[PDB]
Point group: C2
Chain length 74, copies 2
């Protein structure tokens, strides 16, 4: 039929927040991996990671876009 | 006739590259504003923006993925 389940966004949003809460250290290295793909060095991305960790809402939206390739609608 | 997925990307890769050559500082601001979107402070994102300006293909890759949302 015509579809109305919470899409992949809604489902991924849930999963991603838990990880942040439950294994923040793992989610922080994920950001390193992502930025490191583009040649960036730890001394350059260290403070970025550090900024996101102190901002649980930002960090979630960051992971959504950078790790998972999905935009917050509106 | 044909529209290769390779073609649509090489067309957009061309355009954005011609932007990095013609208006590089404007493109550096594009990265800035994308990062600042996530409450990162210019002292924090500055060096990243700098890191990219020094590796133009990475900087080009970065825009392709995160500014335009395209994949290889
Ligand atoms: Ni149906
Ligand atoms: Ni994870
Ligand atoms: Ni360095
Ligand atoms: Ni045709
Ligand atoms: Ni541009
Ligand atoms: Ni600060
Ligand atoms: Zn169906
Ligand atoms: Zn569906
Ligand atoms: Zn997933
Ligand atoms: Zn995840
Ligand atoms: Zn993650
Ligand atoms: Zn046609
Ligand atoms: Zn462009």
């Amino acid at each position: 039929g015509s579809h109305s389940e919470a899409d992949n966004y809604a489902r991924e949003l849930k999963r991603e927040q838990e990880e942040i809460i439950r294994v923040p250290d793992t989610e922080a290295a994920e950001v390193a991996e992502i930025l490191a793909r583009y040649g960036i060095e730890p001394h350059e991305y260290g403070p970025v990671v550090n900024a996101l960790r102190k901002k649980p809402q930002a960090w979630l939206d960051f992971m959504m876009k950078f790790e998972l390739g999905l935009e917050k609608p509106d």
